[PDB]
């Protein structure tokens with residue numbers, strides 16, 4: 001009951017999926033062969049972690065997940081990697097030819113060859129659920145598969161599962177971490193196409209994560225492994241309420257009520273703390289007040305933007321570990337007298353708090369320090385439109401010359417789809433302006 | 441398992457083709473007998489891009505050797521690695537082309553082409569998933585230029601959805617074989633503009649000047665020129681051959697308008713990361729006789745090879761863009777991409793290879809066009825070509841196309857964001 | 859469906875241009891027969 005199925009699309013989605021499922025296993029005490037010695041109900045159960053793991057009669061705990069990519073070499077590393085035994089071979093789906101950084105090939109030319117198979121595997125997972133809650137979809141904006149195949153998959157999921165909820169973790173492109181020149185095109189195309197099909201989308205700016213790794217973990221040039229371990233901690237914070245329970249636990253769906261005031265305004269800003277090296281964590285205990293304070297520092301955002309220059313329509317604090325509400329309330333009282341926290345005039349100004357007691361874990365031999373308490377803030381701020389403005393500007397620069405547009409037309413697309421997608425982004429930006437304006 | 445099919449046509453095409461195979465065979469740990477004796481599993485992880493696996497654990501270049509004369513091809517079979525090629529993949533005529541594009545394109549080349557396409561098909565059908573083709577050839581001759589562009593077109597009819605990539609050696613009077621080279625080059629450029637996705641311009645005038653000026657070689661041989669070609673070709677294929685790249689991703693990110701697909705390659709050294717970056721962007725290190733300070737960059741790809749700080753590569757690549765921002769078109773954001781491969785080329789601790797789409801490439805086409813127009817204004821040497829069935833309007837067509845190319849590079853050089 | 863028709867029409871145009879090159883290469887070899 002309340003199962004969530006995760007779908008990992010393209011290289012970014014798959015590699016982040018590797019990191020996330022490894023972290024889940026460590027948090028839950030599941031070994032790489034899928035055995036979970038603490039779990040006394042063999043082959044089934046209704047425990048909180050069963051929202052994310054099914055069980056075989058042989059004691060294996062299997063991610064409710066599908067990994068899909070149009071080339072094989074990233075999923076092959078899952079097939080041969082440390083956690084190969086976690087997954088049934090049928091959950092890992094690959095084609096032979098990727099989308100060549102081209103939305104059109106991911107959505108149409110190549111993607112249409114494998115979409116029916118992907119949907120048949122997802123159906124196989126859904127059929128094992130007694131009360132499917134929805135989907136979590138992991139993908140980049142910029143790749144041909146992450147943009148184009150994900151939009152196709154989302155459109156098909158709406159047809160096959162109705163209004164069943166679909167949440168995204170979307171990797172927003174940054175020049176620092178490698179990136180095709182056409183990624184602004186792919187980003188706008190997939191954002192426009194998926195907008196009506198997604199209920200809530202957590203954007204993750206690769207530049208934000210890159211900066212956090214360089215600045216807080218003192219890593220000179222972070223790798224994908226560095227970025228994805230940090231990303232998995234944010235994902236884990238956000239899904240922890242689904243996977244654990246406790247008296248102070250608040251379900252992600254309750255936060256979602258507060259975070260989405262209009263269907264299209266569904267892009268929360270995530271901030272996480274604390275991110276600290278082993279050397280600095282040793283002999284330093286970060287208190288509740290300390291980590292809370294860190295959420296309001298822009299350097300700790302998942303997306304680069306300035307909330308001081310927008311307005312809030314919601315603020316949610318997801319705590320894990322050694323945290324009691326008394327310390328939370330005090331920390332928030334302090335924050336509210338020292339920070340620029342301006343809400344829109346049509347929404348209440350309370351912070352919604354949840355506490356998950358299970359403490360955070362880290363991957364042994366990684367760079368993140370193990371801490372006793374952490375927090376992820378989810379806010380809905382009009383400032384997140386700065387991220388769309390930045391992407392729309394790069395789009396416009398190229399599109400006014402039609403640079404690279406022939407690679408999409410060659411695959412059957414029309415310029416009409418470009419201007420329609422760009423107009424939808426313009427209306428999105430205007431939506432964010434309108435909701436921040438004071439009421440008459 | 442994204443296979444490339446390699447085709448070498450003519451004298452120049454076969455000689456640089458053969459050096460290319462010697463060079464990357466050494467890099468992957470393959471000996472002339474086709475057996476692997478390397479020391480790093482990174483040499484074999486993508487070996488299948490360029491090699492077929494055979495019986496006895498042998499690796500065979502997925503290569504096709506084509507000429508209208510047996511000469512050069514017999515040299516290839518005799519030279520080092522001569523017996524690594526699949527013997528059925530040699531396809532040679534007897535008559536030759538006579539440095540006549542019309543002979544390679546319409547007459548002699550045309551009745552050898554079908555037997556070349558039979559070998560292409562055999563190589564393609566055993567491919568798990570073909571990326572496309574790469575052709576080495578010169579544009580000044582007759583076989584590589586005339587029959588090479590014929591092969592390109594005929595292959596495009598059977599594989600319309602595969603990438604066509606060429607390494608095309610441009611003629612220079614400083615190395616000049618014949619006098620009709622500007623005809624053969626212009627006729628060839630005409631076809632390349634229409635039927636290839638990406639073309640590395642390997643300019644014999646750049647290679648000569650590099651050998652003479654920088655390397656201090658008073659009498660540069662073809663051996664000295666080709667040494668530059670092989671190092672360049674190894675450099676621009678690095679990301680295809682080791683475990684970020686494939687031919688289609690390369691074309692998607694380098695070619696904003698389908699006709700503007702002629703790349704200026706660069707190599708350093710000809711030693712610190714700043715020094716290496718500086719030299720890679722210097723006009724002296726361009727394999728095309730064009731000054732990038734006389735145009736603007738549409739797109740750039742750089743591969744650094746060897747063990748070095750990637751943070752220092754990132755800082756220096758950002759450095760050269762910020763300090764020269766006027767030379768990078770503003771309407772393609774983030775148009776310089778950088779890759780790093782740990783494995784250096786043979787004989788260097790580190791190296792840098794540069795692939796630029798610069799509007800300064802027009803200086804190359806303008807040089808050929810003036811050598812063309814000087815002969816065509818007086819109808820010089822036309823009988824060689826009308827004598828095979830051609831008419832002057834085809835010369836008039838080929839040169840207008842190449843001048844349009846120049847105008848188009850100029851139009852985007854002059855275009856602004858606001 | 860629209861994408862399928864568009865891409866097919868682009869391939870058709872491409873092959874039609876290539877087959878016009880074949881016709882021109884025959885007119886060239888026939889044009890050589892008529893001067894011998």
Ligand SMILES: COc1cc([C@@H]2c3cc4c(cc3[C@H](Sc3nnc[nH]3)[C@@H]3COC(=O)[C@H]23)OCO4)cc(OC)c1OC
Nearest residue numbers: 178179180679685686689690693739740741777778779
């Ligand atoms: C095969 O040769 C190369 C090609 C590219 C090239 C390539 C070339 C480019 C470019 C982008 C990109 C993209 S980069 C990307 N990273 N993530 C997604 N896409 C892609 C990726 O793979 C590619 O092959 C593309 O911008 C200007 O020139 C780049 C190279 O090095 C930087 C290589 O140099 C030899």
Ligand SMILES: Nc1nc2c(ncn2[C@@H]2O[C@H](COP(=O)(O)OP(=O)(O)OP(=O)(O)O)[C@@H](O)[C@H]2O)c(=O)[nH]1
Nearest residue numbers: 010011012015098099100101140142143144145146
């Ligand atoms: N954070 C993070 N970003 C990644 C990772 N892998 C790729 N990216 C980013 O994703 C974008 C490129 O998309 P990819 O996921 O690699 O491409 P793809 O989905 O496989 O699409 P194609 O290869 O074109 O078929 C760029 O912005 C990359 O920086 C990753 O492991 N972690």
Ligand SMILES: Nc1nc2c(ncn2[C@@H]2O[C@H](COP(=O)(O)OP(=O)(O)O)[C@@H](O)[C@H]2O)c(=O)[nH]1
Nearest residue numbers: 450451452455578580581582583584611617665
């Ligand atoms: N860089 C280089 N150029 C060559 C080589 N061989 C011939 N050329 C050039 O190629 C042109 C002649 O074409 P060629 O290949 O010899 O004629 P083909 O055999 O009919 O294709 C001239 O411009 C020569 O300078 C070579 O090995 N290296």
Ligand SMILES: [Ca+2]
Nearest residue numbers: 279280282283
């Ligand atoms: Ca300390």
Ligand SMILES: [Mg+2]
Nearest residue numbers: 010011071098
């Ligand atoms: Mg990919």
Ligand SMILES: [Mg+2]
Nearest residue numbers: 451539581617
């Ligand atoms: Mg010759």
Ligand SMILES: [Mg+2]
Nearest residue numbers: 676677678679
């Ligand atoms: Mg390379």
Ligand code: NA
Nearest residue numbers: 039041044045
């Ligand atoms: Na159980």
